[PDB]
Amino acid sequence: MTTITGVVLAGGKARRMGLVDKGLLELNGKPLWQHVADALMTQLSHVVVNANRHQEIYQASGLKVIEDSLADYPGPLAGMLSVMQQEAGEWFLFCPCDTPYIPPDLAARLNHQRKDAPVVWVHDGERDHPTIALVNRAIEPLLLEYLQAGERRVMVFMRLAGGHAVDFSDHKDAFVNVNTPEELARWQ
Numbered sequence: 001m002t003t004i005t006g007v008v009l010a011g012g013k014a015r016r017m018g019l020v021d022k023g024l025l026e027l028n029g030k031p032l033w034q035h036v037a038d039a040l041m042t043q044l045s046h047v048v049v050n051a052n053r054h055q056e057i058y059q060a061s062g063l064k065v066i067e068d069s070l071a072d073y074p075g076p077l078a079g080m081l082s083v084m085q086q087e088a089g090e091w092f093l094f095c096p097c098d099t100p101y102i103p104p105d106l107a108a109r110l111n112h113q114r115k116d117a118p119v120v121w122v123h124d125g126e127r128d129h130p131t132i133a134l135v136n137r138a139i140e141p142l143l144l145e146y147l148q149a150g151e152r153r154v155m156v157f158m159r160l161a162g163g164h165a166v167d168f169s170d171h172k173d174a175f176v177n178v179n180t181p182e183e184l185a186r187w188q
């Protein structure tokens with residue numbers, strides 16, 4: 001009943017059981033994934049999180065937690081597809097759990113710039129961020145076919161799907177990501 005569902009991508013898998021859970025690393029007392037979720041909730045009413053470890057911890061802030069299908073597909077696309085299979089509604093705005101400064105015009109600018117394409121993603125002036133992406137429902141069967149073919153490459157898929165980059169180069173540093181606990185330590 002709203003137009004775009006926001007989605008925090010907190011990562012797959014768990015060949016990572018027993019490793020750092022990056023989305024739960026805290027920045028000024030608040031888990032990174034919640035900084036992303038809170039920024040998406042500024043701009044969208046309905047926001048969910050895709051998480052495959054520590055689900056109970058993710059569930060404690062009261063948002064729906066969506067787990068990957070047993071297919072165990074690789075990479076960020078697998079989370080996107082699991083969310084589309086488990087949520088209704090025609091558009092999704094995905095964002096990884098490690099980019100806590102995303103701006104309040106993310107959804108609005110991606111939508112303004114979509115120009116009829118079924119997918120658009122953020123370019124920050126230096127690089128594409130193809131997991132920060134506004135995706136139409138119609139992508140679901142193409143994603144399923146691509147992952148069932150054993151493919152994983154995110155940019156390749158976005159290109160095959162007819163998407164384009166949207167220029168956010170004027171948003172200084174809104175798209176910086178925390179790659180490691182070492183980097184997080186610097187942003188405190």
Ligand SMILES: [Li+]
Pocket residue numbers: 017018019
């Ligand atoms: Li653990």
